[model samples]
Target: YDIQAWKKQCEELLNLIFQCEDSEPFRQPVDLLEYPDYRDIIDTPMDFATVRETLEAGNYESPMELCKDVRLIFSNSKAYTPSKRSRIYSMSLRLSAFFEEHISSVLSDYKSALRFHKR
Candidate 1:
């Protein structure tokens, strides 16, 4: 079952999420929560060139980008084995919880006449 391992992985993912946010080269709008100097970092709308320039101006972005890519970089390193029952169950619970919140928000303004299709 390895319930402890599953919990550890979940905690790791949560930490990775924050790490991803913190390691960002350009500040996000939410950074407005911290300091006033960051206002320039926040109030500006996202422009790819500006973001690129800002990131290039500093050494912090490149190594962090490499670290960020590590998730995909070592894709071939691990063997593909079936997950244990506890792993599967814990993942399902997490997915269901996320889906419940997502679907509730999405469907809240639903209309019977609404229809969607993908090309």
Candidate 2:
């Protein structure tokens, strides 16, 4: 599956996510003092920094595996955040959209390359 290429793709996506201005709230783990119930409901919380660490630690088996963790960052936000007006909520939404958009492009090419080889 060309795992090295997939990891590079994941690293690029992580870098893109980190550079976005809306990424501030998601760059690190949620602080317990600020949201005492975060862990209670999230069940599996994730953040950009954790994603970075995971990537650096060579923990992911595939790009989609990495993307699943990336998805959790926003999924957890939507799970706990009730307000439609909170900037963090909106930021999560926007960043989620941005991630899917770019990842689709990455996958489209990756998949086609697979087809092109077929050996």
Candidate 3:
């Protein structure tokens, strides 16, 4: 899949996280989002709309533009606490999956997308 797109979406979300008016959105506990490892769900069924809408709403913009530097932005962010770090990581992971799947699903080439869904 296009890692570029994934990165874009992630970076956009990161920006949103930073730009959030209050910490309420970003400070929400991690478990609420449900953390999932990419390797594990790389081949499972997915609710495409759910994934798409959630990420889009979370980022509050088209994820395509944010994919440019998602990794660096996310990694470099200052997380003073474990819960904060976990929340960021979990959100990042889920958005990354959305990026991968969105591309695969659109190209009508569900190979890798399907693989990750099941993983």
Candidate 4:
């Protein structure tokens, strides 16, 4: 698919995931090795709006690059605490699954369309 279409699909998926009633909470590590508390880590819930803004303004030329950015956002965040780190990793996995499902569905639909066109 074209870049714009792919981005639109990604944006829609993000919106759907973030807007869900049962969306997972964005948690932080309970303690820090150097500090008394998790000071550097984000305390608020995962801000999907910020993520969307980042995706919109990002310089990704392809879907792969966009995926990398998405992965990095979770992977690179607050690594000082294990619990927070684990949560982010889990979140990324869920996001990856959703992305894969969408791509698979799109490809299946495209293949069906091509079969019809061939006839």
Model 2 residue 87 CA deviation (Å) reads 1.3
Specify the highest-lDDT model's number: 2
Per-residue accuracy of model 4 over 1-119 as CA lDDT, tens digit each: 23245567667877776765423433222234634544455443234455566678865454555555445444444443376446645665566566567656544544465557676
Q: What is the lDDT of residue 34 in candidate 3?
A: 54
lDDT of 2 by residue, 1-119 (tens): 44247667778888988889989999999999999888888899889999999888988765667778888888899888868778899999999999998888566666666666785
Q: Candidate 3 regions off by >4 Å?
A: 1-66, 77-85, 104-119
What lDDT does the true structure give each of the candidates? 0.31, 0.83, 0.40, 0.53
* lDDT of the structure predicted as candidate 2: 0.83
Q: What is the TM-score of each candidate against the true structure?
A: 0.23, 0.85, 0.25, 0.47
Q: Give the TM-score of candidate 3.
A: 0.25
Pairs that clash in candidate 1: none
Clashing residue pairs, backbone N/CA/C < 3 A, model 4: none
Worst lDDT window (10 residues) for model 4?
A: 22-31
lDDT of 1: 0.31
**Candidate 2 clashing pairs, residues 3+ apart or interchain:** none
lDDT winner, 2 or 4: 2
| Candidate 4 global CA lDDT score | 0.53
